A paper describes a structure:
Gram-negative species couple polymerization with translocation across the periplasm and outer membrane and the master regulator of the system is the tyrosine autokinase, Wzc. The tyrosine autokinase domain forms the cytoplasm region, while the periplasmic region contains small folded motifs and helical bundles. Autophosphorylation of the tyrosine-rich C-terminus of Wzc results in disassembly of the octamer into multiply phosphorylated monomers. We propose that the cycling between phosphorylated monomer and dephosphorylated octamer regulates glycan polymerization and translocation.
Reasoning the negatively charged Glu would mimic negatively charged pTyr (phosphotyrosine) and create a protein resembling a locked phosphorylated state, several Tyr-to-Glu mutants were constructed in WzcK540M. Analysis of cryo-EM images of WzcK540M with four Glu residues (designated WzcK540M4YE) revealed ~50% octamers, as well as other state(s). A 2.8 Å-resolution structure of the WzcK540M4YE octamer was determined using the same approach as WzcK540M. The core kinase domain is unchanged between the structures (rmsd 0.4 Å for Cα atoms 452–697) but the tyrosine-rich tail has undergone a large change that now places Y708 at the active site (compared Y717 in WzcK540M). In WzcK540M4YE, helix α23 is unwound, and the resulting loop no longer makes any contacts with helix α1, whose position is altered as a result. In WzcK540M4YE, Y706 points into the same pocket as Y715 in WzcK540M but this residue no longer makes the hydrogen bond with E675. The change in the tail results in a reduction of the buried surface area that holds the octamer together. The structure of WzcK540M4YE, chosen to mimic a phosphorylated state, showed a significant conformational change in the tyrosine tail, which would be predicted to weaken the octamer. The WzcK540M4YE structure shows that the tyrosine-rich tail would be accessible to the cognate phosphatase Wzb. There is some evidence for different oligomeric states (other than octamer) in WzcK540M4YE but none were amenable to structural determination.
Residue numbers in the entry:
A (entry chain H), B (entry chain G), C (entry chain A): 17 to 64, 85 to 261, 409 to 477, 494 to 709
The structure:
């Protein structure tokens, strides 16, 4: 978790980190390029206090007069069915539509919820056009006033592009004041000077300057019953969205979520990470088999594979460690199903067979052993058919043609695995084989699941646990070795398995 | 209690956590959707100080005149018998009722407690109607004034919906002023400017604007004997309830009570939680039997059950641990009643019997032993009938047909259990059985209750305590082993029992 | 990492440090000498408050009048195709071009994006000239007004130098105000005094004084409908760029990036740095061979080389350490490929051969051994052809003519290296050679890659690891020695190799 570990794991996770940071920055870029620009216009008003005037300009007396003058309760919006149609239309350089209605009158439905009745205008050409309110499309012309079904609408100088849609809202006068007041702002910048820096912000730049001029002139005429130094002009540079600030916030947010998520995943996993985690508990790791990219045995399929090199390292370390053992029986038990126990056992048997010693591979996993499904098999007369007494030692032994070693499958699943393994025929078999073979690899179920491994390991000189690299935890290995000790079985050490090529010391040589 | 433990237990308790948080958020949602909306109207008053004026507007001179003008001491409320009828009626979109009374006069009961006499109006149609005060329903019509029994009520423009009920309260003028003053508010926003931002809040939006206009105009006319810039208009967005703030508070409160309650339950329980709690005290846990979902023996009913796999693990660990013991008698004692002692003893006997050794199961719980109620029994001539000398060793031994092992029940409850067990016939029985059987499992009462276990364990080579997973505490096990030591009995170890499948290492295999 | 280490490594890295600091300071110098100078002019205005006046001077009423007077919306720039052409032109002492246009009128394209239509003027002589807008070059003369294609341009007193290019921009009046306002500044310096210290900054010094005089006089005439104490004069010393501040910032930035980068590289490397790093772990370093600057053996090519002196030191230390060893076989294994293992083994063999003892050099790296590619070879009948049984001990031994020692190459690459080395012929060979030779140096692959070294080291009395100086890490050496221990091989110590002459204690003597 230290800085060195941090940088190593971040480079290991660099794909995820850059992916999520880049996707957030892409969202930031698309938003900052599609967010409608907001322009700001400013005016300067001169008086000879000004504390009241901040509150008279923003009063519904002054603003409401501007709505009554510019007809700001008639709202016009170019229709884009997507949420980003307007932005993309601007990006393509398309001129945005605009029309002028000097007199609009909806049927005054003005319901409690839909107090803002909405109609859609369909432009057909530069002169004639139609409106769809709820289906009845009334064709009209600029100039002449259409008065049908309570629709009194007079549009003039309609825009050029045909086929466009304009949503029209006759929103209430109070709303048309409140939104203006929200977009409007006053300040003093002298704290006693007559200087008032009126600011109004909106999307339509030519419209906001007109609105602010109207506000200033209405305030002037009202105060007559004050000097407008310079009328309102719009700054051509939009003030929102702030493109630079958005993007850097996108980057910082992407990196911060990346860091929190990578630390979350680091504190998520609990499996083994290195042989030294087991060796701290006092467990001799005899090999760290790296994960092989690759039905035949890997030891005879691709003998030059790194996993087979690690298994040969295991063969030599076992050959040293298994001398002085009471007999030549080696019991390999996986710390869990899906620990790679039969992989390791079968290939270790093959690599010891090519050496030239006689190897017997007993699959004493009577519960879900499948070595017969992987070596090519005579399924009749396996191990369970022998412990049940209905077979002899010779009809159960086979020959793996590839690996070059003898093999005893489980046979049929018995209903009483543990009760079968306790039968004295099993020690008979082992005593016979240990005379007629050089090494016997017995392959047993876990010990955290059943007790079979602890029955078999009574007659085995060497017992080894197999742990998958990041699947099994240290707790499982420790509990398994303690449970083996309770039953009088000494687990010599562990075979850590399926270690990633990032963490394996093995590399291709030759 | 660490963060890892915290998250693990919260996911374990996620059902309760999400249930209570969701129910609080549901209460918050129903409240925020049923709480009557409160609208706010604002007006702006201009003067040329204003410190006194904050206190003249809110004076009973100005307000009381508005009550006298708008008849605000006549209260009208649509009747909803539930506490949430009004909210649900609004939610269904129903128009809320309202009527107008320009002249109301109750009989002026005006008692000390009920100084606000209440009557209920029953609307029958758009023109005629009736009132029930205390039973006498007087039928009346809008327009004409009904004057009966001191009821002078003139209602006009009664609402549309028939059959509704309106509770009418002629609350006192002082109350009609005090509530208005509570809902009314003034400020200055310039600290010297003539700007007064009058605000009045209420549920009826069209009514509060009228009230605030009346207040402003009364203040104007009074000050004549000041300028109203813009009259009162109501903001259509209700200011209360604050729906968003309520919901987030509901979520935060649900989570905080969830955390405090889960920590409370964590600090509530004191039972055993893991074998390592016992192993810290120096107690050898020989098995952790997981809780079986499942009258016959589980070892013969469902031999593939996980609990029977754990008992076979116990069988092998005992077989190793019981060699070198002075005799083949195993004494199993529960740390408490309801520790699963007879479950474990019976199934361990069955699993050792299927192996092929001769097992005698003695139920030396002479107080409330019920193995005979569970194996199928000849209740005559049990253990107590033998210690009393009125039976021989042969008429007391039985055969469990399922388990395949011999069995000795307690027989009849004696009046002197401990005094019976001390009789030298019991050691005679054990010395005989230990010659004619391979394993003898004696099943004894607790030691924190009686002394029988410490009498029996004098003749037992191996003694084992059985602790239920979260029922028995570590204190009970420690006190039991110390009390066994005082009596010269060595408790070899413990059998932790009924461990939950969340905490058991056993899993199904095959 | 301590101050002594810091200074030592900085002097070691002084080339990089001074290189990067000098390149940043060179960039700073070129920028500070090419950044266009910015002059500042100041004026003093006297009034009898002045808080409003700070905001009237900077108002678009006053500034816009100055643009309308001096035609500041007509922008003129001498064209330099590089980004630094203007700076270099000034540095060469060239007079900068300038022309005067009293009336300019572009075709008023004024598009949404290109609202600032740009044209380029091509001066041909002191009187006549031409303009290229988008290709159509219209020839014109100073004085007379050319009016073609909507181009109304009247330039007069055009500059001297022919062939120059002037980019002309009729930028909008609002932009011509906003840039001026950005460059303009007012202050009071008395906080109540009428003193206003107007400051205007720009590149053209004669132009900014004229602009500030125009601003002051326009403000004066406006306030008539205030006293200009001293008109605007430009300080001849440019105020930007601040040459001294830039250079010192360049130096400080260069040194700070140098420090952070050298510390980054220090915390980057993880290889061995000294023999004491290995000796801390308990590893006997027997030699530290320094890196030799130099196909024949270095021990016979340049016997006076420092690396050969270090190998003779290794020869004596080995001679002492290898007495009492079980046999005269020395196994040298590199901790990694590219550790210099065959370099060290071959030269140690040569230096022991010149002494006069019989040396056999066995190249038991059957995977990628190349001693035969370096001694001159008969490639037939190597080691692998002997273990396969298809050669005898005599046809595999050779004579290195230079080194003076016998030699056994690997031969052909076998498909089963480890399986070959396990054949009992290898111990036959060693037992024979250890009788017919004084020292046998067996050269083996790594142990972190294959298991061959641990097979060979079973029959070797002394085993030595070879670590490259900064390539191999301490972790590799420790893991290699532990993996050798697992297989029953005792690694006597290490030979640290390729140590830099900065860190080697060896020096030329004689």
């Amino acid at each position: 978790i230290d800085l060195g570990r941090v940088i190593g794991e971040l480079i290991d996770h660099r794909k995820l980190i850059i992916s999520i940071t880049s996707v957030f920055t892409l969202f930031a870029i698309l938003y900052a390029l599609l967010a409608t620009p907001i322009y700001e216009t400013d005016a300067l008003i001169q008086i000879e206090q000004s504390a009241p005037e901040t509150a008279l300009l923003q009063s519904r007396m002054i603003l409401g007069k501007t709505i009554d003058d510019l007809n700001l309760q008639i709202q016009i919006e170019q229709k884009y069915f997507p949420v980003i149609g307007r932005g993309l239309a601007r990006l393509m350089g398309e001129k945005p539509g605009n029309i002028d209605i000097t007199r609009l009158y909806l049927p005054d439905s003005d319901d409690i919820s839909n107090n803002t009745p909405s109609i859609i205008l369909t432009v057909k050409d530069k002169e004639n056009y139609s409106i769809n309110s709820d289906g009845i499309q009334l064709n009209g012309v600029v100039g002449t006033l259409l008065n049908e079904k309570g629709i009194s609408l007079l549009v003039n100088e309609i825009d050029a592009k045909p086929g466009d849609q304009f949503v029209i809202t006759q929103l209430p006068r109070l709303k048309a004041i409140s939104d203006l007041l929200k977009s409007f702002s006053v300040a003093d910048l002298g704290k006693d000077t007559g200087m008032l820096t009126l600011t109004l912000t909106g999307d339509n730049p030519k419209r906001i300057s007109h609105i602010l001029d109207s506000i200033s002139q209405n305030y002037l005429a009202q105060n007559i019953a004050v000097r407008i130094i310079d009328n309102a002009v719009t700054d051509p540079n939009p003030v929102r969205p702030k493109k630079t600030i958005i993007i850097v916030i996108g980057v910082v947010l992407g990196l911060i979520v990346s860091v929190v998520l990578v630390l979350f995943q680091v504190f998520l996993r609990r499996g083994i990470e290195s042989p030294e985690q087991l060796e701290e508990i006092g467990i001799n790791v005899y090999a760290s088999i790296p994960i092989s990219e690759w039905d035949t045995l890997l030891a005879v399929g691709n003998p030059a594979d790194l996993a087979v090199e690690a298994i040969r390292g295991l063969r030599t370390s076992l050959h040293f460690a298994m001398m002085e053992a009471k007999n030549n029986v080696l019991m390999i038990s996986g710390a869990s199903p899906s620990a790679g126990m039969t992989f390791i056992s079968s290939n270790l048997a093959a690599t010891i067979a090519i050496t030239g010693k006689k190897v017997l591979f007993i699959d004493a996993d009577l519960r879900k052993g499948y070595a017969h499904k992987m070596f090519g098999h005579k399924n009749d007369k396996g191990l369970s058919e022998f412990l049940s007494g209905q077979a002899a030692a010779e009809m159960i032994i086979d020959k793996v043609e590839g690996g070059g070693f003898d093999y005893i499958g489980r046979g049929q699943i018995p209903p009483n695995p543990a009760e079968l393994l306790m039968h004295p025929r099993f020690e008979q078999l082992l005593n016979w084989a240990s005379q007629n073979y050089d090494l016997i690899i017995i392959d047993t179920p876990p010990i955290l699941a059943v007790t079979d491994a602890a029955i078999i390991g009574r007659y085995a000189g060497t017992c080894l646990l197999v742990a998958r690299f990041e699947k099994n935890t240290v707790k499982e290995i420790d509990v398994s070795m303690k449970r083996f000790e309770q039953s009088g079985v000494v687990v010599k050490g562990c075979i850590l398995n399926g270690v990633v090529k990032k963490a394996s010391s093995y590399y291709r040589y030759g």
